[PDB]
Write an enzyme that holds these catalytic residues in place. Structure first.
Site, PDB file in Angstrom:
ATOM      1  CB  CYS B 109     -73.794 -18.150 119.119  1.00  0.00           C
ATOM      2  SG  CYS B 109     -74.749 -17.271 120.358  1.00  0.00           S
ATOM      3  NE  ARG B 112     -70.101 -19.149 121.158  1.00  0.00           N
ATOM      4  CZ  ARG B 112     -68.907 -19.591 120.777  1.00  0.00           C
ATOM      5  NH1 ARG B 112     -68.494 -20.817 121.098  1.00  0.00           N
ATOM      6  NH2 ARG B 112     -68.116 -18.799 120.073  1.00  0.00           N
ATOM      7  CD1 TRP B 281     -80.286 -10.516 124.501  1.00  0.00           C
ATOM      8  CD2 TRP B 281     -81.157 -12.049 125.904  1.00  0.00           C
ATOM      9  NE1 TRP B 281     -79.306 -10.869 125.404  1.00  0.00           N
ATOM     10  CE2 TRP B 281     -79.816 -11.805 126.274  1.00  0.00           C
ATOM     11  CE3 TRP B 281     -81.912 -12.977 126.647  1.00  0.00           C
ATOM     12  CZ2 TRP B 281     -79.209 -12.461 127.349  1.00  0.00           C
ATOM     13  CZ3 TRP B 281     -81.310 -13.623 127.711  1.00  0.00           C
ATOM     14  CH2 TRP B 281     -79.970 -13.362 128.055  1.00  0.00           C
ATOM     15  CD  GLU B 286     -79.206 -11.097 116.114  1.00  0.00           C
ATOM     16  OE1 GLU B 286     -79.591 -12.138 115.521  1.00  0.00           O
ATOM     17  OE2 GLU B 286     -79.232 -10.962 117.359  1.00  0.00           O
TER      18      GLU B 286
END
Ligand code: HEM
Ligand code: HEM
Ligand SMILES: CN(C)CCc1cc(F)c(F)c(CCc2cc(C(F)F)cc(N)n2)c1
Ligand SMILES: CN(C)CCc1cc(F)c(F)c(CCc2cc(C(F)F)cc(N)n2)c1
Ligand SMILES: C[C@H](O)[C@H](O)[C@H]1CNc2nc(N)[nH]c(=O)c2N1
Ligand SMILES: C[C@H](O)[C@H](O)[C@H]1CNc2nc(N)[nH]c(=O)c2N1
Ligand SMILES: [Zn+2]
Lengths: 411, 411
Positions: B109, B112, B281, B286
């Protein structure tokens, strides 16, 4: 023990058994993966013979003569010579086989589909830096082939004791100089600023400009390295223009046609070749993305975006990305229009997947380092992004080595 | 044992000692690095108490009460309850701490930096799929905050035996349907074609179009999963336009504002939460890169390049790359103009480096998976490309789990 790697774009599954033959260590453990560390980390006669036997066992197995008498005698012959010499000498065919498989095994190299078409130049009779210059010049001329680039490697004498080493102090045969300015800025290639200063320290009269082809700095048999200027007619260069933007020529960009790494170490059956410059041809992104747009390299995204008239105020205008694509269209277009061999990251990554399929069938696998294989732009619109890759270290191999100016006992 | 990771853009070196606390295994060995494998791979009361003790020892150490009586009693209290129940229940504060550190520890991720600002919704009193629907609806509404997106997670009851599991069968709370056509092509999102067919199999009346928000398919306490349509007023969507190309609206593209993964498993002190949908979000890529331009997803590079008037004949025209940048400028611009939270890969990767620096100082490290952290476009013009990252598995964590329709004994 017979691991599976998957392509998540095509759902193709390949089975890797070649990793079983792997010998060296990767740096990773069961508890920590070091797959993104950039540079992970004499030789006695006891260590030498398993390594020779291992190598010779695969060499005769590849010419379909495994375990024959001509094998066993060569096996015995090298055993005897390691007893008597505490080292040994490869036959010419073993040198060629070794060097091709060092490239074949180079997990970070996306160009390996061509590994079997490598021209090996045996420079193991060389004794002087002038001789190295002569050999490297012939390599450059051959590899360049007037823009029809040809893969080649030139192999200088193997390491013996360790204080008699042949070294090309240059990291590549052809590189542009880098000069720190009075105002702290950098002219030319910032990567080479230190090496550029070594050449000046040794008497190089720098033309203190942008794209000044550095001189060769060659060390023979442990002696002090000597400067040699490659005949400019041998240094093929490409002026960079754009097929749309006529202001792009006014950027005054150019690059050299021949990528030729010269600072790495070739290991073959436990023999270490400290000077083994090898050359191929560029994938466009090496120039367009990293050379031209790394912050600590030429760093031209600023000026290209200015001349493109780009919203440079915000990060999310993707002005960096937009200028990056134009820069790489231009590198490719300039090389192709000049008939200088170059491959785009789309062609090269597709070739590597096709290469991987070949290696998994007729070899049981293909060691591959995803972190380096995926191009530095447009990663996921290339097939290698979606390809799982097993990284493991096979031999013969190219290895990193310390820069000679930290190791060398001067005179 | 105290490993160093380097940034090759800035020459910053950080020292990782946190990996010492690592417990789980990575899949790599000394001889093979599996850093690019995508999905590497009941519970007894003996196994449970070290895991609870380990977790509680870091929980009290974080509120500056390590080894106190209130610690030891909680330690004893959980020991006794695992003896008596062969499982145990987290306090509310331990659930919040656990979930935040599962996100903090998520090496793949890049978002973070926000891990401490996570809103934890305790759904551990839920008993029915209707109750799950109610909770997920409240989560969606809260997290969306009318485009001012807020990080959240909703935690349904922990696994007990293993045949009484709470599961969101959806891979994400909000996803577009995918329908295979008669002519073999795919309408909507090809990723979800199988799950779309499961919803039809369970009685979903598909509006067989492009961007049909799938229904929730919710399994409570092992029972058969039940369909629920999220009130459309809760599904915030962004129509995708371009700040230059007015034909871009005519592409009819849109996406949903809320990324909310619902198929993963949260592990806290050895307790397994099989249904723990969490939301944040989007980073623009992506949507713009993977959702829109993966070959096996919406795959719109073709049409965008057609409308851009692009040399689509050759690979080396970089027409794919050029259309990819425009698509991502458009995703970002559309979200920002609608005041729906979105981050560009330049902002998010810089934040992750700043996050890494924080974690190395005040925590001794930051587990990070380079393969996933580097964005799928323009990799090397982001700072994370040049950042060495150590990947290791810490707990609490989010883990993958089988899809429930392979595991579930139906009725
Ligand atoms: C024929 C065309 C070739 C192409 C297109 C190509 C492409 C590439 C690229 C893009 C890299 C990534 C490393 C970087 O970005 O700096 C690489 C690495 C590498 N190449 Fe190839 N290459 C070619 C030929 C060769 C040849 C002929 C050899 C050796 C004889 C070779 C040996 C290597 C090695 C050893 C590395 C990895 C360095 C490391 O371990 O860090 N390449 N190549
Ligand atoms: C706040 C904004 C956030 C952003 C911008 C963000 C961004 C990303 C991105 C780009 C990925 C890459 C995976 C992919 O490409 O599909 C990822 C993975 C992941 N995210 Fe974050 N995320 C955010 C919030 C969260 C939250 C709130 C959680 C949990 C509570 C979370 C948990 C995870 C996990 C567990 C993964 C890895 C999945 C795996 O192991 O394969 N994220 N994130
Ligand atoms: C982080 N940096 C300093 C690593 C240096 C580095 C070491 C290498 F061994 C290496 F191959 C490269 C790629 C250049 C290159 C080489 C070749 C080949 F034919 F010579 C072909 C090609 N297309 N590109 C770079
Ligand atoms: C290969 N695919 C199928 C993996 C699936 C997958 C699993 C995950 F756990 C995961 F986080 C993602 C990223 C989506 C995402 C999630 C979140 C978070 F707030 F929910 C925020 C964000 N910006 N993006 C994808
Ligand atoms: C930190 C990271 O390992 C480093 O930046 C790597 C990433 N991948 C790369 N890939 C290639 N081809 N060349 C590189 O120099 C790098 N650099
Ligand atoms: C083969 C490879 O592991 C796979 O394609 C990964 C690469 N890196 C990724 N990185 C992110 N953020 N998301 C992904 O889905 C993937 N896919
Ligand atoms: Zn690894």
């Amino acid at each position: 023990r017979f691991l599976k790697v998957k392509n998540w774009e095509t759902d193709v599954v390949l089975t890797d058994t070649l990793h079983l033959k792997s010998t060296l260590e990767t740096g990773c453990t069961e508890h920590i993966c070091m797959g993104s560390i950039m540079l992970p980390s004499v030789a006695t006669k006891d260590q030498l013979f398993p390594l020779a036997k291992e190598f010779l066992d695969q060499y005769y197995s590849s010419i379909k003569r495994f375990g024959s008498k001509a094998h066993m005698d060569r096996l015995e012959e090298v055993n005897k010579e390691i007893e008597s010499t505490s080292t040994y000498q490869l036959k010419d065919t073993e040198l060629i086989y070794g060097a091709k498989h060092a490239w074949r095994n180079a997990s970070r190299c996306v160009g390996r589909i061509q590994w079997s078409k490598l021209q090996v130049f045996d420079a193991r009779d060389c004794t002087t830096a002038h001789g190295m210059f002569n050999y490297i010049c012939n390599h450059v001329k051959y590899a360049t082939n007037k823009g029809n680039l040809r893969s080649a490697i030139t192999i200088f004498p193997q390491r013996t004791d360790g204080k008699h080493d042949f070294r090309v102090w240059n990291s590549q045969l052809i590189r542009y100089a880098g000069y720190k300015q009075p105002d702290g800025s950098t002219l030319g290639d910032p990567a080479n600023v230190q090496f550029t200063e070594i050449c000046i320290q040794q008497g190089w009269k720098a033309p203190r400009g942008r794209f000044d082809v550095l001189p060769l700095l060659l060390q023979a048999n442990g002696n002090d390295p000597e400067l040699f200027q490659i005949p400019p007619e041998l240094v093929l260069e490409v002026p960079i223009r754009h097929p749309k933007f006529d202001w792009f020529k006014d950027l005054g960009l150019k690059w050299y046609g021949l990528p030729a790494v010269s600072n790495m170490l070739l290991e073959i059956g436990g023999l270490e070749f400290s000077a083994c410059p090898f050359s191929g041809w560029y994938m466009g992104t090496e120039i367009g993305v990293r050379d031209y747009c790394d912050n600590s390299r030429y760093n031209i995204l600023e000026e290209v975006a200015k001349k493109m008239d780009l919203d440079m105020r915000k990060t999310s205008s993707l002005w960096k990305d937009q200028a990056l694509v134009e820069i790489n269209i231009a590198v490719l277009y300039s090389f192709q229009s000049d008939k200088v061999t170059i491959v785009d990251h789309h062609s090269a990554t597709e070739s590597f997947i096709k290469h991987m399929e070949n290696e998994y069938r007729c070899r049981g696998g293909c060691p591959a380092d995803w972190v380096w294989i995926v191009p530095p732009m447009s990663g996921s619109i290339t097939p290698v992004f979606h390809q799982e890759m097993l990284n493991y270290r096979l031999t013969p191999s190219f290895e990193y080595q310390p820069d000679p100016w930290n190791t060398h006992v001067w005179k």
